[PDB]
Amino acid sequence: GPGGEMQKIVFKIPMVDDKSRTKAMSLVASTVGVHSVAIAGDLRDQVVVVGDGIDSINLVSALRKKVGPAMFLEVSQVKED
């Protein structure tokens, strides 16, 4: 509700192939606070994460170590009546 919204964090992660995408997904889905994650975008490299209390610092560091050169695209709150 208003004041208690989920986080929305979108990364751009240049992906070699579907194997990088699978790894991104498993990593994000095993991260504390994450509710759900999707990959889409024009290059299938937009990683949309939603959740609560996600430590984006540690998440982006892990993606950079394990997947590829992740960049922040967006940080926002989910609009929820």
Next chain:
Amino acid sequence: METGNKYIEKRAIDLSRERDPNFFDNPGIPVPECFWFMFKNNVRQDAGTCYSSWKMDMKVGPNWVHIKSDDNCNLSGDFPPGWIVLGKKRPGF
């Protein structure tokens, strides 16, 4: 209009000729009402979805931009030179 003359208008990005964003409406959260499209020198970079009557921080090339949306999905922010993010209301919303 005699032969050999030329005429054009200014080249305003036309969202009606843009393919939809490759979006995924996450079933756990409210469906966002807007599409956004990011351009540099009129060349599409990427596209996505966002909420109407709302706000977000988005990385637009070399600069963070604080993007506000109105109820019709018009997007405002201090975009870096040559960049823009344009919104449209999704069909049915």
